[PDB]
Design a protein around this ligand. Structure first.
Ligand SMILES: CNC(=O)c1ccc2c(NC(=O)Cc3cccc(Cl)c3)cncc2c1
Ligand SMILES: CNC(=O)c1ccc2c(NC(=O)Cc3cccc(Cl)c3)cncc2c1
Ligand SMILES: [Cl-]
Lengths: 305, 298
C-alpha cells in the first residue's frame, strides 16, 4: 500500500556525470564510452547568447580549450563535434562505469527521473513529466545545465532529456540526447515564453485508477460519457484532449478495477465540476497528472483493495 | 527555480542491496563490509529459540548473480546480522544514525535484492512513515548523505492496517511503539510537523510566492495555542532558532511567518496554491529547504 512520486535509482547515471569547463563557463556532461555529451552553449559568453553563431564560435576552439573532469581525474579531449544543440567531446578514456543505454525522444505526458548536478557532482534525484507545452517543472539552479532525465526499464538506462535553460516563468527547457529541443525553444536569449499549459488527462485517469486500487472509490458515480462529450467538458478546464489511443492504453487498468474508461471519465467530469469538498485522493487535494498508466501498473499491486 | 520533493542520489546504497532467503521467506539485506543486515522476521515468536535452530547454510544470500556464503549469524534487537565470506567491495563510508520525528530521509525501495525506486519521506510525529511498499519490500533502507558519508537511519519491517509503514533504525530498535509480529497494532493520531510547514512557507517566499504574508506578528505562546487546536506539533524555541537563516534570507521574522500560518489555519487557501500545493506541506525540513535553494552536491 501507499502511493508516492517515485524516481528510478540513480546509480547507473551518477557514474556518468562529469564537469565540463570552457573558458569561464562550467556545466555538466554525460560521459558514455569515449564521448562526453553536454549543452553546446558551454562555448558561449552571456553576450553571445543574444544571437549566437555556434558554428563560428566552435571553429575557433581547439580540444585543449575544453576541460573535462571526472571526479578527481582530468580527462583528455581528443576531438569535438556538434550535433544540433549538443556538443560531443571525444575523450581518451572510455567510461568503465558505462551502463547499458539508449537515447530515446519522449512525447509530452511521459515521465522521467532527473539527476540534478552542479560541477559534475549529483546533488539530488526527482521525478517529473514532459508537460503538454514541452517544458518541465523541475528544480534547477545556475550550474545545473547538462543534468539529465532518464528511465530505467529492466537493466537499460533510457536517456531522454538534457537540461539547457530556465524560462522567465521558472519552468525548464532542454533537448533529447541528439540535441533536438523539446518544444519551440532555442538555446538563445530571446523573448520566448512557454505556451499555455494543460493537464495531462490520460495521467489524471491513471492516478484515479491507482486510487481505486488502493481502496478509495468516493469519487465514482453511476454515469458514463461519450468520448466527445468528455472532451468538450475537459477542454473547458484546460485538460488535454483524450484520444482513442489514451483509452486503449488505459485498458489494463480498466480490466483490473472493473471500471470502464468512459465511466472513469464521468467521475473526472464530476470532480472537475464539484472539486473535492475537503477530501483527498491518495493524500492529494489536487488532481495529479505526473503518473503515467505504465507508472501506475509498475508501482501499484496487481490485486485491488 | 522550482521546488520538488528530492531524494539523495541512491548509487552508494544500490551497491549494498542483497536478497536474503530463509526457508520460504524472501526479503532484502544491506551488505556492508562482511556483514549482511536484514529484519529478524526472515526466520519466522521467540526469536532466540527460532534462531538457535538455524544453521548458516539455511540463509541464502544473493548479491546480483553471485551467491554469498554465510559463515556466522547473530541478532541485535529486531535486526539479524549475517556474517558473510566476502567483504562488499562497494561498501561506502557509512554511519548508523537514529533520527527524530520530523526529520526526513530517502528510501531505496527493493524487491528480491533489486532496487526499484527512490523516494523522499519523513518520520511522522507518530513514528510511522507514509511510504510506498509492496510484499517483498522488507529490508528496504532509509538514508541521508553528508558529504561522502551515507547515514543509514531506517530499515523497513512492516505495513500497518491504515497503509502506513513501520521499521527500525540499523541497530534493530523500532521507531514508535511497534513490535515485529502479527498482532493488533495501530498508528497513533498524527500531527503536522510545524517547523517543516514554516520552512516550506519560506521556500515559497524564496521562489516568489508571497500572497500569504501579512503585516502581523504573534507571540510564541499565542501561536502554540492556535497550533494545538489544528493538530500541529508545538513550535519550540529550538525550532525558531533553526529557522533563523531562512528568516535572515527573506527578511521575514519567524513569529511574523507564524502569523501567516495562523491565518492559513483559520481561513484556508481560498482557491490558491503554494508551490503548486493546495495543502500545507510538512515533509521538507529547514535544512532541506536551504540545501535545495543553494545547490549542495555529493
Ligand atoms: C533561482 N534560479 C535561478 O536563478 C536560475 C538561473 C539560471 C538557470 C539556468 N541557466 C540558464 O538558463 C543559462 C542559459 C541562459 C540563456 C540561454 C540558455 Cl540556453 C542558457 C538553468 N537552469 C536553472 C537556472 C536557475
Ligand atoms: C501489496 N502489498 C501488500 O499487501 C503488503 C503486504 C505486506 C507488507 C509488508 N510486510 C509485513 O507487514 C509483514 C509483517 C507481518 C507481521 C509482522 C512483521 Cl514485523 C512484518 C511491509 N510493507 C508493505 C507491505 C505491503
Ligand atoms: Cl514517450
Amino acid at each position: 500500500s501507499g502511493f508516492r512520486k517515485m524516481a528510478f535509482p540513480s546509480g547507473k547515471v551518477e557514474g556518468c556525470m562529469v564537469q565540463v569547463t570552457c573558458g569561464t563557463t562550467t556545466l555538466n556532461g554525460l560521459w558514455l564510452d569515449d564521448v562526453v555529451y553536454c549543452p553546446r552553449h558551454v562555448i558561449c559568453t552571456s553576450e553571445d547568447m543574444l544571437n549566437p553563431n555556434y558554428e563560428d564560435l566552435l571553429i575557433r576552439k581547439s580540444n585543449h580549450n575544453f576541460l573535462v573532469q571526472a571526479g578527481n581525474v582530468q580527462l583528455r579531449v581528443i576531438g569535438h563535434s556538434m550535433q544540433n544543440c549538443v556538443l560531443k567531446l571525444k575523450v581518451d578514456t572510455a567510461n568503465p562505469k558505462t551502463p547499458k543505454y539508449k537515447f530515446v525522444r519522449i512525447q509530452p505526458g511521459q515521465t522521467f527521473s532527473v539527476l540534478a548536478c552542479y560541477n559534475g557532482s549529483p546533488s539530488g534525484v526527482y521525478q517529473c513529466a514532459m508537460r503538454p507545452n514541452f517544458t518541465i517543472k523541475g528544480s534547477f539552479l545556475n550550474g545545473s545545465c547538462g543534468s539529465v532525465g532518464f528511465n530505467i526499464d529492466y537493466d537499460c538506462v533510457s536517456f531522454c532529456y538534457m537540461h539547457h535553460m530556465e524560462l522567465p516563468t521558472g519552468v525548464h527547457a532542454g533537448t533529447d540526447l541528439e540535441g533536438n529541443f523539446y518544444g519551440p525553444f532555442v538555446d538563445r536569449q530571446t523573448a520566448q515564453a512557454a505556451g499555455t499549459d494543460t493537464t495531462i488527462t490520460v495521467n489524471v485517469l491513471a492516478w484515479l485508477y491507482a486510487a481505486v486500487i488502493n481502496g478509495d472509490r468516493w469519487f465514482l458515480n453511476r454515469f458514463t460519457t461519450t468520448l466527445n462529450d468528455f472532451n468538450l467538458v475537459a477542454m473547458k478546464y484546460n485538460y488535454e484532449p483524450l484520444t482513442q489511443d489514451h483509452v486503449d492504453i488505459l485498458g489494463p487498468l480498466s480490466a483490473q478495477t472493473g471500471i470502464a474508461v468512459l465511466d472513469m471519465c464521468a467521475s473526472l467530469k464530476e470532480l472537475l465540476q464539484n472539486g473535492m469538498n475537503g477530501r483527498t485522493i491518495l493524500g492529494s487535494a489536487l488532481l495529479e497528472d505526473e503518473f503515467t498508466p505504465f507508472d501506475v501498473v509498475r508501482q501499484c499491486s496487481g490485486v485491488t483493495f
